[PDB]
Amino acid sequence: GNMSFVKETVDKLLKGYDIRLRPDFGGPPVCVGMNIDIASIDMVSEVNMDYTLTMYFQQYWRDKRLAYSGIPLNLTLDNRVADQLWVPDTYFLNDKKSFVHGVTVKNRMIRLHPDGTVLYGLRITTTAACMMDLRRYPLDEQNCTLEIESYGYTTDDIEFYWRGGDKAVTGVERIELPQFSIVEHRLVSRNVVFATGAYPRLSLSFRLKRNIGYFILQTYMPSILITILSWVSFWINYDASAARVALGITTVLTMTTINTHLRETLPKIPYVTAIDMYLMGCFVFVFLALLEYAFVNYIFFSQPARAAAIDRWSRIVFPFTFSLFNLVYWLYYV
Amino acid sequence: ASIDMVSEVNMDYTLTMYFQQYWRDKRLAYSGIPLNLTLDNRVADQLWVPDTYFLNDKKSFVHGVTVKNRMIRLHPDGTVLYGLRITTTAACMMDLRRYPLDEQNCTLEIESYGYTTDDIEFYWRGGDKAVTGVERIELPQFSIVEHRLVSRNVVFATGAYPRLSLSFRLKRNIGYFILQTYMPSILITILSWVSFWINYDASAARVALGITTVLTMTTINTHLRETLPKIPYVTAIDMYLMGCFVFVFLALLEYAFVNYIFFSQPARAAAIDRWSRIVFPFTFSLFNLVYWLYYV
């Protein structure tokens, strides 16, 4: 109630307080509990092999230098007091670029409790690396992680834990990615060793299943229909040389356009993806359809009966063998 | 002040605004001066101000030239007015199932960062008149149909927080899509029917018309797909283009059917061309009627 009394209490806490020294300096490690509330995953980029995550990052620890008596309240203080306290040196080890949101003030919370428990909250956007295995792309599953570590303090000085255990990360249901669903998330704690010492580590990880639907409507269905168009050639009279080579050329060349468009939003990886295997298959079909015309063209003067037989067989064999190709492919990858 | 951008690709929009906060701080009450005191902006660093943030913002700043764009006005009773000029890019999850005949609801959510409803309460000052300048929004691709102001309390583990919401309903303008998507697709479809008046002996001519109409449809789609997120569902415009594609593909198959029979059956072949000339325009007219009634 008395603001001068609280001002006195708070001024007393910070009088002779050394921000250079962690709580219990030289004694047992300070235990830091972590909660995350996920706000969003805004982007996943195959090109940059990274994703963008926005989150409320809460840290709890006890600093007995900040214990207070005679006030049965938790004290929420204006954010700027964070510059007058020790706070943990926590960083995201797989981040590429990160900031604390700044409008209308730095997005940051301090709450003290009578026993000296500090709650410290931050709203962070982080772009984080995600090495992706694109061998089964776009029928791929990715494991995207956020690694949380102490920068300078070893496990002698600091220990990390998920506060609330497996309930410590919330808001996974808020993630609304058009191209992905979150299958699962896991929370891991370990200690990691470098030359400079042993460091506490926490890991959050997600398993991300890519949605097939975009690729059906704008990659697989185009390629199937260009393949079907190539077979129209088998019902055109063999005397229509211009017509049949035109169907052959335009089907062979549209396959290239599918591939170029798809390759435009993907890293320059040195291996074959699942979608590339489909398109190579389709390309072989449309190329062979054009060679079939060259074989017919080559023999129809001398052997008009054999020429007619080859067109009449092609009409059954190319659709059937493309159906088999599709059956083998879609069973292997789904 | 403005909505500068709406991005379907990034599912966000950019908003620039004068954000005014009023509260009473009796520590700042003064006597013997019958004036309101407007102080230089830098005094804001010596006062408590609310910890207000935009919960759906992606990146935001307070404008900085020629000084930080920021106002403090005290009143004798200790009322503080605190003004800020803010640009914010804010998330807008968009339902693109009816795109481009879509309506979007784009929001700005305003919350206390650290103070619960024990410490702070928010209200729209002037009630439903608290947000002005909606008529200043000049988006080429959109009109603002409606705006609404909402107040609620929101609960997290750390406590109950005051929330204000501003929301707009944004109707996309069809005109750009008529001139640069729907009309191209209609005319490529009409071009495909020219084939039905060309003699069936002109095999190269008729397959060339078929190929070039089938392949230009793909170009329409690619161009359109270049400025849209990789969504896994079908949009209204995709349904139109798939329809057009079926028409132009069937026109080419009609030639293959004519080509296949005209040697043995020149009368039946001639009949099929003569029927096509009526049936393809009529069935495309019906397709358009059904589509435009369903989506308008």
Epitope: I175, E176, S181 | N56, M93, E109, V154, Y161
Partner: nanobody, 108 residues
């Protein structure tokens, strides 16, 4: 005994991506059971019903279902269905939810 509660939605379900199951016992406060996203099917449960009840949906019918298996005499309450807005807070807190169903009484 095994049972299947269902919950059928209609209207602007895009603005309300989450559906939640609550239950209110006589005297006690309204209590979280579980919740499901319409898009993705991302699911959460209270500890009490963890590895007993299962929620899923179908977007075709605009329907969510609570499959109440391995029932107990503690599971005796007015079970309500509710929708949560995109920015409306934590899953667990009933005052975050806006559209409430009628409420089926269940006794065992």
């Amino acid at each position: 005994g095994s049972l299947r509660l269902s919950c059928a939605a209609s209207g602007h379900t895009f603005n309300y991506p989450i559906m939640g199951w609550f239950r209110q016992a006589p005297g006690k406060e309204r209590e979280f059971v579980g919740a499901i996203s319409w898009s993705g099917g991302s699911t959460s449960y209270a500890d009490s019903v963890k590895d007993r009840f299962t929620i899923s949906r179908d977007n075709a019918k605009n329907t969510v279902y609570l499959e109440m298996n391995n029932l107990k005499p503690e599971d005796t309450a007015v079970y309500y269905c509710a929708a949560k807005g995109r920015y409306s807070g934590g899953l667990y807190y009933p005052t975050n939810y806006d559209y409430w169903g009628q409420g089926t009484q269940v006794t065992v």
